Amino acid sequence: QEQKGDAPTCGICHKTKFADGCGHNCSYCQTKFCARCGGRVSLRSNKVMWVCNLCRKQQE
Ligand SMILES: [Zn+2]
Ligand SMILES: [Zn+2]
């Protein structure tokens, strides 16, 4: 991680730029993806985890 004024980008379409900070990161691959290249999977009200369509699908 290096703060060089680099904006947030999707690791799939590389188009959708995350908001001020960080977008959705795969709870597995850890890859940064947009709300369209992943899904919301919270493990009980305490922590919200996002899994890419490749993990959410392959992992059923
Ligand atoms: Zn994307
Ligand atoms: Zn993943």
From Swiss-Prot:
The residues that the entry says bind Zn(2+) 2 are: C26, C29, C52, C55
**What is the protein name for this chain?**
Regulating synaptic membrane exocytosis protein 2
Positions of Zn(2+) 1 binding:
C10, C13, C34, C37
Tell me which tissues or organs this protein is expressed in. Highly expressed in hippocampus, brain cortex, cerebellum and olfactory bulb. Detected at intermediate levels in midbrain, hindbrain and spinal cord, and at low levels in testis.
Q: What does this protein do?
A: Rab effector involved in exocytosis. May act as scaffold protein. Plays a role in dendrite formation by melanocytes.
The stretches annotated as zinc fingers (FYVE-type) lie at 4-60
Describe its assembly: Heterodimer with PCLO. Part of a ternary complex involving PCLO and EPAC2. Interacts with RAB3C, RAB3D and RAB26. Binds RAB3A and RAB3B that have been activated by GTP-binding. Interacts with TSPOAP1 and RIMBP2. Interacts with PPFIA3 and PPFIA4. Interacts via its zinc finger with the first C2 domain of UNC13A. Forms a complex consisting of UNC13A, RIMS2 and RAB3A.
List localization entries. Answer: Cell membrane; Synapse; Presynaptic cell membrane
Classification lineage: Eukaryota, Metazoa, Chordata, Craniata, Vertebrata
